[PDB]
Design a protein around this ligand. Structure first.
Ligand SMILES: CC1(C)[C@H](C(=O)O)N2C(=O)C[C@H]2S1(=O)=O
Length: 265
């Protein structure tokens, strides 16, 4: 029956909607176009941070990187200011999760090393988790620019909810490292109007946003009930009908999350 509202919301905002919530002991998985392929956009920058953290000791974060003003290419609120200081690996992690800083992301790919500036190694890293579906291919900004139909730079609600589960609630990082990821996602600034705006205020919310062309709007989050029961919620959207220059409708994500809340209480 919840399938009738997702499709109802799909009809209202002229969109395609993806939705996965892993299952608990006490609630069944929520599925809508779950195993269907959506574009990452800026959602990759979350698992990327666990990638550095994991193949790197806690002393790495105080390593400094310098960069030319010809590396700065995507939206980069934090990067274009520090072009003369540099940014330590750690600051680049804060940047890339809290502000979606596009350059910071590209340098953290470079820091994984190997072919196609560290995309090979970063899909690499997704496979250690179980994800044999998702795959990053380009750097910022082409991964947002891909045409709808393309299998490149894509994941699924099913695939990415499961990755997140393992990184925040799971044990795919040791507790010391697991705390940085979660704190950075907990003071994200880009999420105000998506999953956060659909759940009541006494639920706590950590999230990493993504936006693209062809109407792409994306949120992956971990949420906590007033009693402290966690869950994982993945919402993904696009609007190819509207053109390459389609507008992304944020309301659609916040509506869908209110639907999910109804079910989780
Ligand atoms: C600049 C982008 C490629 C992309 C874009 O070009 O549309 N921007 C958004 O809407 C989020 C930012 S981004 O993903 O860094």
């Amino acid at each position: 029956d919840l399938a009738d509202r997702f499709a109802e919301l799909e009809r209202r905002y002229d969109a395609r909607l993806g939705v996965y919530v892993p299952a608990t002991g006490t609630t069944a998985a929520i599925e809508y176009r779950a195993d269907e392929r959506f574009a990452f956009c800026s959602t990759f920058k979350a698992p990327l941070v666990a990638a550095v953290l994991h193949q790197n000791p806690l002393t790495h974060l105080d390593k400094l990187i310098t960069y030319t003003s010809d590396d700065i290419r995507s939206i980069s609120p934090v990067a274009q200011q520090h072009v003369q200081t540099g940014m330590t690996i750690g600051q680049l992690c804060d940047a890339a999760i809290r502000y979606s800083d596009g350059t910071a992301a590209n340098l953290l790919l470079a820091d994984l090393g190997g072919p196609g500036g560290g995309t090979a190694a970063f899909t690499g890293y997704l496979r250690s988790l179980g994800d044999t579906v998702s795959r990053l291919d380009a750097e910022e900004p082409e991964l947002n620019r891909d045409p709808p139909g393309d299998e490149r730079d894509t994941t699924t609600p099913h695939a990415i909810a499961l990755v997140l589960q393992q990184l925040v609630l799971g044990n795919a990082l040791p507790p010391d490292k697991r705390a940085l990821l979660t704190d950075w996602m907990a003071r994200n600034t880009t999420g105000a109007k998506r999953i956060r705006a659909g759940f009541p205020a006494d639920w706590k919310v950590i999230d990493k946003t993504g936006t693209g062309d062809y109407g792409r709007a994306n949120d992956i989050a971990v949420v906590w009930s007033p009693t402290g029961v966690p869950y994982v919620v993945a919402v993904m959207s696009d609007r190819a009908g509207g053109g390459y220059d389609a507008e992304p409708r944020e309301a659609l994500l916040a509506e869908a999350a209110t639907c999910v809340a109804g079910v989780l209480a």
